[PDB]
């Protein structure tokens, strides 16, 4: 339903190996991917042209054997499960890839902040600059920060517990399927963005 | 530059010694004195004055058993609206009145309710004319107005309200 | 800052506005008895290889 001029820049692509990223997908997924990144995928071997036989069934990369010996039949339940697994992996990758940015006020050049942060603020900035919606109950601070939350200025890190790990079976490729480490950098900013 | 010379010349008698004998030294002294007195009156006098009056009121309240903090908070609550100057005047010249104010603040007397928002009478929704009479809302407003008129002090208009409302009937000449 | 006599405001309370070890009570008090040659009045806990 895209416009023709916009669709001219995209091409239908079937994913062979699960790739994380704004232009990625799960193994056996059809998506409109941009020309440059789609050509990169097809040159690397992670993508295939969506023929009808391939839409029926596909071969995929096996992590254990390191070869494209995994034949897969594209079905509805398979698509649903793989989409959910891709969502879980994308959330993990987003929260484990880069820094989180906080900007607040602190009178003077002290080391502690004027107003300490909380799980609500952490989840707010997560949804803001990561586009990930989570509830504050999953955010568990460090042993020293269980009292007053994030208070130091500079660099800190918190734990975020992801419940859905063993149901989908991610414990192999992921470092730790139980929780993830969110690195948060807190700084002093101008008034309009500090707001406190 | 406008040096205040001809005005400050006449105040040299207040100074002493060389400032009073010579002219320029006395003029400099008077200029500095007036400038610093104006600065103090603008930015620092009110603080000291209000601190003094507050300390006096606090002492008068402590002689009864309370403090400036609780007294001020409860005055604001009861909505008495007495400035610290008046509180000091009462504490110094009307001890019985100040003690009665303290007793009012201490007692569990219900403070006045917030001012009621002006409401619209029910007759404003009545169709008029329903098919040379006055509007019902206007008549009720006039009645309340005449009531408020008679409520303020004694006057020869009388305490009744119907006879005072029906004054146009009296002024009307029978045709 | 100095806002009182040593009877009320100690000498180690001058840097109370600065953050760190000064906001605590010093361990050694050389202000009583004989005075030091270098005129040191307080010495905090020896943190590692540094002492204030």
């Amino acid at each position: 339903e895209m416009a023709p001029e916009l669709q001219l820049e995209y091409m239908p692509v079937l994913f062979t190996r699960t790739i994380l990223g704004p232009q990625g997908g799960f193994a056996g997924e059809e998506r409109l991917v941009k020309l440059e990144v789609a050509r990169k995928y097809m040159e690397a071997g992670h993508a295939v042209t969506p023929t009808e036989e391939l839409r029926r069934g596909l071969w995929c990369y096996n992590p254990d054997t390191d070869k494209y010996d995994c034949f897969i039949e594209r079905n509805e339940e398979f698509l649903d499960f793989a989409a959910r697994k891709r969502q879980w992996l994308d959330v993990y990758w987003r929260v484990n890839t880069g820094y989180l940015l906080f900007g607040r006020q602190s009178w003077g050049q002290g080391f502690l902040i004027n107003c300490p942060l909380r799980k609500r603020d952490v989840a707010q900035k997560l949804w803001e600059q990561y586009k990930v919606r989570i509830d504050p109950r999953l955010i568990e601070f460090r042993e020293k920060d269980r009292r007053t939350g994030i208070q130091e200025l500079g660099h800190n890190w918190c734990w975020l517990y992801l419940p859905g790990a063993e149901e989908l079976g991610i414990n192999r490729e992921v470092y730790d399927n139980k929780r993830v480490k969110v690195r948060i950098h807190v700084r002093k900013m101008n008034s309009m963005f500090a707001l406190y | 530059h406008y040096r205040a010379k001809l005005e400050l010349d006449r105040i040299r008698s207040m100074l002493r010694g060389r400032a009073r004998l010579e002219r320029k030294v006395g003029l400099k002294r008077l200029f500095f004195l007036m400038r610093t007195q104006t600065r103090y009156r603008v930015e620092q006098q009110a603080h000291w004055e209000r601190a003094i009056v507050r300390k006096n009121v606090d002492s008068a309240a402590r002689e009864h058993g309370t403090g400036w903090q609780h007294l001020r908070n409860e005055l604001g609550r009861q909505n008495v609206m007495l400035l610290p100057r008046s509180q000091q005047l009462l504490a110094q010249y009307e001890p019985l009145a100040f003690r009665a104010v303290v007793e009012l603040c201490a007692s569990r007397i219900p403070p006045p309710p917030p001012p009621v928002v002006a409401s619209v009478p029910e007759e404003s929704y009545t169709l008029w004319p329903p098919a040379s009479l006055s509007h019902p809302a206007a008549r009720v407003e006039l009645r309340c107005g005449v009531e408020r008129v008679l409520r303020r002090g004694p006057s020869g208009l009388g305490n009744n309200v119907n006879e005072l409302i029906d004054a146009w009937k009296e002024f009307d000449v029978s045709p | 800052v100095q806002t009182g006599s040593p009877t009320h405001q100690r000498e180690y309370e001058r840097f109370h506005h600065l953050p760190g070890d000064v906001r605590t009570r010093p361990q050694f008090d050389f202000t009583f008895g004989e005075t030091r040659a270098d005129r040191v009045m307080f010495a905090w806990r020896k943190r590692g290889d540094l002492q204030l």
Binding site: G108, Q109 | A51, R54, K55, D58 | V1, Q2, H17, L18
Partner: peptide
């Protein structure tokens, strides 16, 4: 408040005004 490192130290006049009593 309490100035940090970069802010210069300024000595203000001691508050000599009369203070009320801190009742409990």
């Amino acid at each position: 408040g309490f100035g940090g490192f970069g802010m210069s130290v300024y000595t203000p006049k001691k508050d000599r005004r009369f203070r009320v009593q801190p009742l409990p």
